[PDB]
Write a protein that binds this ligand. Sequence first.
Ligand SMILES: Nc1ncnc2c1ncn2[C@@H]1O[C@H](COP(=O)(O)OP(=O)(O)OP(=O)(O)OP(=O)(O)OP(=O)(O)OC[C@H]2O[C@@H](n3cnc4c(N)ncnc43)[C@H](O)[C@@H]2O)[C@@H](O)[C@H]1O
Lengths: 113, 115
Amino acid sequence: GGDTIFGKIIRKEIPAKIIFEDDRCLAFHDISPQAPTHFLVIPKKHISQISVAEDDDESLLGHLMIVGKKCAADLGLNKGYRMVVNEGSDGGQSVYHVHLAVLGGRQMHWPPG
Amino acid sequence: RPGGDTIFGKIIRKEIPAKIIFEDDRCLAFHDISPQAPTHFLVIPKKHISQISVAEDDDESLLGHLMIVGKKCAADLGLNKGYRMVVNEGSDGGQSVYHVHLAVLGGRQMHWPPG
Ligand SMILES: Nc1ncnc2c1ncn2[C@@H]1O[C@H](COP(=O)(O)OP(=O)(O)OP(=O)(O)OP(=O)(O)OP(=O)(O)OC[C@H]2O[C@@H](n3cnc4c(N)ncnc43)[C@H](O)[C@@H]2O)[C@@H](O)[C@H]1O
């Protein structure tokens, strides 16, 4: 599932602290957390960036958000959280494998970067 | 009422004005009145959902559609160098209008952390 570090994590070739898995996505704690809770939800399908997502993957993208919601509740983020998808260089995208970041456990500020 | 009681519901029903980018049967995209980047717009469902934490499992397709519409609108608006999509949830997330919204920000370098 792709030649990025996230592909390696999906294939279990390198470790990550996994929070949830199903047949089509994986959620795991970020190695460089920016909040007391900071995790990622990624599709197993290697979509490199949201700008190239296909119409057919619309429900998969929504699935990432529902999994993110559920994981956030399981991790006790009852006061709220921020979900982020970065695209390209201006977006600060650090890995070319689509990922939904979920941050909470502190006040998130505005602007969001 | 279709669209709910918030200002976003009013925007959906054309009761207060907005600068609309895209509209279909499921969602609406419009510019933010307090932009935090040179381009800053919102994508909202026409179905009222107060916040992502209460979205239903059957809302998956709709939520994904907000993301697809966001990326298509960003391309139409010339955000070729990239952008950031944000969903704020609740108090810690910085949400104040309780109608879910996906924000899309671009036209400048975005920084880390994202707030
Ligand atoms: N017509 C429009 N068109 C396009 N884009 C639009 C738009 N309207 C909003 N947007 C944009 O949509 C996005 C999402 O909005 P969002 O970020 O979710 O909320 P908001 O639009 O910023 O509304 P705020 O209440 O936070 O405004 P404020 O900063 O003045 O806080 P306040 O001092 O009143 O108070 C602080 C807190 O206390 C709450 N509060 C308000 N009144 C009371 C009260 N009497 N008692 C106790 N708490 C109160 C407030 O709700 C708030 O949470 C934003 O980017 C926004 O710019």
